[PDB]
Amino acid sequence: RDPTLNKTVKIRQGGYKGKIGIVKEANGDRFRVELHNPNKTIPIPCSF
């Protein structure tokens, strides 16, 4: 049941490398992660 929901995550690739966030939506292969650094939420692939 999407075990990574509401868990702290870090981005390793792309334009947001090394930013801490929290996973909000876990439909599939496209995770919505809110960023702690600015006040916004972005989509991101699971591999990232």
Partner: protein, 263 residues
């Protein structure tokens, strides 16, 4: 055909005169130096403890604006172009700050000299905060009283001033041409007499004033440009000029490659 003549030279500013170039080339060079020369600046702040009276993001914004030595930033890679998971030593520089006030009286000032470089690229002269001298304390970051502590870990990345003004190596580029207005590129507002109501340019002695009987020359173009490049200390003035030229060359070469590969 182009010529360069240097008037004053310093570590932080150079005053030079360009000649036999188009106005567009000089302006593009000025724009490139202002907003397209890569430098190194703090881009992530991890705040492990902050009991000072300043907000966390207040101090983060202040830290991002501190200039860091960016001499060997060419060897460094962009964060988005590094295949390493997380940040490695080849795409980031880690600085750490730890400040505390001891005793129950007095106030402690936190300066940028307290930023200590922990990790970075091997043997590359990058990351150290810029200091005017060996005894210069640097930029004032915060103030602390008894039992207030600041403990942070900052990560510096490579970028350009287009993305954020903290990566700009230059402060203000004075730019000027045609002190005596022989080209009539500007029309002078006046009340009584336009000649005695307008201050002379600081380079007015470098060009012969027009003769009283001289007619207007419609075949003339701006030919000599006077420009002063001031830096924040992250890069020397000559380094800023040379790297602006190199960046412009790289941009044009990329356009040329795109054209040649289009067919």
């Amino acid at each position: 055909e182009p010529k360069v003549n240097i008037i004053n030279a310093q570590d932080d500013e150079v005053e030079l005169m360009l000649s036999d170039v188009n106005l567009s080339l000089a302006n593009s060079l000025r724009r490139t130096m202002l907003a397209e020369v890569p430098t190194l600046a703090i881009d992530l702040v991890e705040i492990k403890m902050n009991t000072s009276v300043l907000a966390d993001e207040f101090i983060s914004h202040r830290l991002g604006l501190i200039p860091l030595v960016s001499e060997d930033v060419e060897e460094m890679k962009y964060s988005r172009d590094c295949t390493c998971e997380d940040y490695c030593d080849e795409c980031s520089v880690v600085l750490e700050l730890s400040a505390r006030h001891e005793g129950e009286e007095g106030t402690t000032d936190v300066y940028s000299s307290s930023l200590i470089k922990v990790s970075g690229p091997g043997n590359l002269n990058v990351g150290e905060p810029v200091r005017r001298d060996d005894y210069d304390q640097g930029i004032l970051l915060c103030k602390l009283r008894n039992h207030q502590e600041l403990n942070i870990r900052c990560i510096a990345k490579k970028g350009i001033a287009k993305e954020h003004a903290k990566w700009s190596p230059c402060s203000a580029i004075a730019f000027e041409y045609d002190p005596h207005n022989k080209l009539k590129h500007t029309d002078f507002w006046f009340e009584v007499d336009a000649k005695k109501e307008w201050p002379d340019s600081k380079y007015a002695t470098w060009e012969e004033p027009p003769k009283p009987g001289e007619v207007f020359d419609y075949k003339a173009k701006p030919n000599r440009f006077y420009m002063t490049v001031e830096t924040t200390g992250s890069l020397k003035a000559n380094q800023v000029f040379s790297r602006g030229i190199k960046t412009l060359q790289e941009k044009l070469a990329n356009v040329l490659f795109e054209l040649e590969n289009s067919r």
